[PDB]
């Protein structure tokens, strides 16, 4: 909970009155994409 | 200004791996938040010294006739909305995509305690506690007196009798009324008058884009994006790698912590001077040399500004 | 929506968008002040499409000490009173959700989105500040959220001729501290 | 009164805890720093383990000096930031002590006209107390209290001459005009005397 996060960043187990910055949050990504090129041909490596 | 930095998003940004480094790199995050927290709170408490010299809010009755003198340009005007006198709301426009940019970078700006209706709405009350009472208001109960009796008392500072005044009043207020009209052409006509105030956000704002442009910083290394570096050398290759970019990026950081605590000492000093001026130079008459104006101190009246206070010093100078 | 991308390399994170860069036929990607990259063209469909962050900003707890009591209030900074997390399936990494974060007591200020403190049309001393001029303080058996006052409200009688003189006095005895060395 | 403002001095102090706050934020601030730099012992600093003792002990020293290279600076590092926030924060140190010198010459060696700068009223005389780390002032002021109203005039006219007061104010209450210092309030007939 938002009271146990500020213990953690104090080290320690009471807190006095007050206001504190105690972490950022962001928003996680779902899933992934990927886009590439459409080419197909194999590169003419045996020739070399 | 105040400015809040997110250690890891400035250093690592989207790299989960580099936030994973990081942590083996000390406690250096956790002290450049406490060094810049300290600074943003030590703002909140310059304003209060200044401006909160009072506890009551005293108003100025509404017939406003003084013995000639006008203060018309200095008492706030209701038709404006946010309640400034006319000099006061001339100083703020004479002071003023990028902001964006540097949010994305983990560079925010917090917004101050006290709102600027609030500073006005305190110096509003010592005008009026300077004008309807005098000095007394700075030590107790607050004593009304006539105006043009109590500029009689500020000339027996001086060493010129009352008489000199009570012979003089008609001629007084017109010098004086004269004087006041002339200040707001001054600033208004010379746009180099808040040169002072200027360079406080230049140096602000130039100081954070310095730190903007060490991001596109190889520091020795092959590249400055982390995601190519990762996604092209094995693990213990990227290793060497990677810390050359964190620690030259640690780097920035606490040189930019450095000089914006040096900084806020100087702001400090600057702060505490304008504090003394307020109780000493407002709240009472000075017969200190040249502290309050050149010439004999009579009077001083506060006008808020955009990081900032502005002293009009009235003085008596002799001629002929 | 807020995904993974990957351009022939360009691995990244972030929310895709139309962007309406007059892109030029030559031109490959955009580039912001910050010298980063800002907006793309993809490999396939040829289309400029913006980069933009997934949202983000400093979350703040505010408390009265533990010996008073245990309830807390939570401040999302720069926040605009609808971006605030409202699914906890795996899609923020902060756990400690608050218990409704809507429907419940919100507040939108300038300094960011207060929920679990209550508004009220008094106006009392500053106890905690919050930005502003709003400040906060636990009242009652529950936290609320107020506008500092300045001070208690007066009016000098000032006259054409009057004048006020005191008849007795009072000897004061006051503090002050000061360091002097470490 | 006297007596009685410097008896209620004492549970001030006593009762109010945050009252030494000023000189309790210089104590903690050092040793918080201390804390610090011995904490950073614990950093591998992107080396194998913070131990120096195997890290010799289990690599050839071809390889092992450029791991407690990493060590070494990291270290250095966190010796040069301290010293720096240590000339900063004495710089301002010095800046109260500065005050506190200054304070001692124009409060407790004589009386002082400046506004506010010893305590808040009419100066009288202060007197010093050592603290742990600092001093303390006790500041005595003179305070007015219990005003009351009258109506005033600037000049007193009589046989075609005017008159004003020489070190004082003309008040009436209502009917009779005398002449009373502006701080207080003792009224006397108008001579040619106090005119
Ligand atoms: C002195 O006070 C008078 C009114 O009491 C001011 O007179 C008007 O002021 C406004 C600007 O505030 C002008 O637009 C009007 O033209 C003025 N009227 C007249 C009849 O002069 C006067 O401006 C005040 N003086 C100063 C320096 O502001
Ligand atoms: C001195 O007289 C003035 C009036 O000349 C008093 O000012 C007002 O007095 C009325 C009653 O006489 C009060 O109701 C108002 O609150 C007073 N203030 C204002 C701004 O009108 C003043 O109170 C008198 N002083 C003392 C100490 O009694
Ligand atoms: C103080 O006395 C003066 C007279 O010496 C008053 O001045 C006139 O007051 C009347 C009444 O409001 C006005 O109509 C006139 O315009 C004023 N003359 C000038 C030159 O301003 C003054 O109003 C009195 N003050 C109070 C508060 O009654
Ligand atoms: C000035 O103040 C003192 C005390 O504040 C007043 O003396 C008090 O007088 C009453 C009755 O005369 C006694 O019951 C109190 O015990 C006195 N106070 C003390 C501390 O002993 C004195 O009357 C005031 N003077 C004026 C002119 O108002
Ligand atoms: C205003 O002050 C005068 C000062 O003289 C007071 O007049 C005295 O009043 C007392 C009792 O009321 C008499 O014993 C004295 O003889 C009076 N002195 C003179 C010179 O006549 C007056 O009472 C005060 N109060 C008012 C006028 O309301
Ligand atoms: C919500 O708050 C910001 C405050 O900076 C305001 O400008 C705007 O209405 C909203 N912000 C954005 C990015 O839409």
Not at chain 2, 180 to 188: R, V
Not at chain 3, 73 to 91: F, G, K, M, R, S
Not at chain 4, 128 to 145: D, E, I, K, N, R
């Amino acid at each position: 909970d938002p009271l146990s996060e500020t213990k953690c960043t104090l080290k320690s187990f009471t807190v006095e009155k007050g206001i504190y910055q105690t972490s950022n949050f962001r928003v996680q990504p779902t899933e992934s994409i990927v886009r590439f090129p459409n080419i197909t041909n194999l590169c003419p490596f045996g020739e070399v | 200004t105040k400015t809040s930095v997110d250690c890891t998003m400035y250093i690592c940004g989207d790299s989960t791996e580099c936030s994973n480094l990081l942590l083996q790199y000390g406690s250096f995050c956790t002290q450049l938040n406490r060094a810049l927290t300290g600074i943003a709170v030590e703002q909140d408490k310059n304003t209060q010294e200044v401006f909160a010299q009072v506890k009551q809010i005293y108003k100025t009755p509404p017939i406003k006739d003084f013995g000639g003198f006008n203060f018309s340009q200095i008492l706030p005007d209701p038709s404006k909305p946010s309640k400034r006198s006319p000099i006061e709301d001339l100083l703020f426009n004479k002071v003023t995509d990028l902001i964006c940019a540097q949010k994305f970078n983990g560079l925010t700006v917090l917004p101050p305690l006290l709102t600027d209706e609030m500073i006005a709405q305190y110096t509003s009350a010592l005008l009026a506690g300077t004008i309807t009472s005098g000095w007394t208001f700075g030590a107790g109960p607050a004593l009304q007196i006539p105006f043009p009796m109590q500029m009689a008392y500020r000339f027996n500072g001086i060493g010129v009798t009352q008489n000199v005044l009570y012979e003089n009043q008609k001629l007084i207020a017109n010098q004086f009324n004269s004087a006041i009209g002339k200040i707001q052409d001054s600033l208004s006509s010379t746009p180099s008058a808040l040169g002072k105030l200027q360079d406080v956000v230049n140096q602000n704002a130039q100081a954070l884009n310095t730190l903007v442009k060490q991001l596109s910083s190889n520091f020795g290394a092959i590249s400055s994006v982390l995601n190519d570096i990762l996604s092209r050398l094995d693990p213990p290759e990227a290793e060497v790698q990677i810390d050359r970019l964190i620690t030259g990026r640690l780097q920035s950081l606490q040189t930019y912590v450095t000089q914006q605590l040096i900084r806020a000492a100087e702001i400090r000093a600057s702060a505490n001077l304008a504090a003394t001026k307020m109780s000493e130079c407002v709240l009472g008459q000075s017969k200190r040399v040249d502290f309050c104006g050149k010439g004999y101190h009579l009077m001083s009246f506060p006008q808020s500004a955009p990081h900032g206070v502005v002293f009009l010093h009235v003085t008596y100078v002799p001629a002929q | 929506k807020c995904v993974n991308f990957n351009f022939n390399g360009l691995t990244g994170t972030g929310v895709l968008t139309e962007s309406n860069k007059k892109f030029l036929p030559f031109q490959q990607f955009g580039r912001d002040i910050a010298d980063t990259t800002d907006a793309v063209r993809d490999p396939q469909t040829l289309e400029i499409l913006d980069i933009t962050p997934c949202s983000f900003g400093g979350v703040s707890v505010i408390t009265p000490g533990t010996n008073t009591s245990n309830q807390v209030a939570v401040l999302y900074q720069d926040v605009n009173c609808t971006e605030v997390p409202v699914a906890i399936h795996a899609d923020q990494l902060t756990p400690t959700w608050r218990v409704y974060s809507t429907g419940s007591n919100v507040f939108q200020t300038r300094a960011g989105c207060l929920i679990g403190a209550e508004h009220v049309n008094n106006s009392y001393e500053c106890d905690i500040p919050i930005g502003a001029g709003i400040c906060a303080s636990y009242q009652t058996q529950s936290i609320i959220a107020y506008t500092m006052s300045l001070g208690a409200e007066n009016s000098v009688a000032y006259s054409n001729n009057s004048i006020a003189i005191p008849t007795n006095f009072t000897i004061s005895v006051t503090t002050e501290i000061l360091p002097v060395s470490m | 009164q006297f007596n009685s403002a410097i008896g209620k001095i004492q549970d001030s102090l006593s009762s109010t805890p945050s009252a030494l706050g000023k000189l309790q934020d210089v104590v903690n601030q050092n040793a918080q720093a201390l804390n610090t730099l011995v904490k950073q012992l614990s950093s591998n600093f992107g080396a194998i383990s913070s131990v120096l003792n195997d890290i010799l002990s289990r690599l050839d020293p071809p390889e092992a000096e450029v791991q407690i290279d990493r060590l070494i600076t990291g270290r250095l590092q966190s010796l040069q930031t301290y010293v720096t926030q240590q000339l900063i924060r004495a710089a301002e140190i010095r800046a109260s002590a500065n005050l506190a010198a200054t304070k001692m010459s124009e409060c407790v060696l004589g009386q002082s006209k400046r506004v506010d700068f010893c305590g808040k009223g009419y100066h009288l005389m202060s007197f010093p107390q050592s603290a742990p780390h600092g001093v303390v002032f006790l500041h005595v002021t003179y305070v007015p209290a219990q005003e009351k109203n009258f109506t005033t005039a600037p000049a007193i006219c009589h046989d075609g001459k005017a008159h004003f007061p020489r070190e004082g104010v003309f008040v009436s209450n209502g009917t009779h005009w005398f002449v009373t210092q502006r701080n207080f309030y003792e009224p006397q007939i108008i001579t040619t005397d106090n005119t």
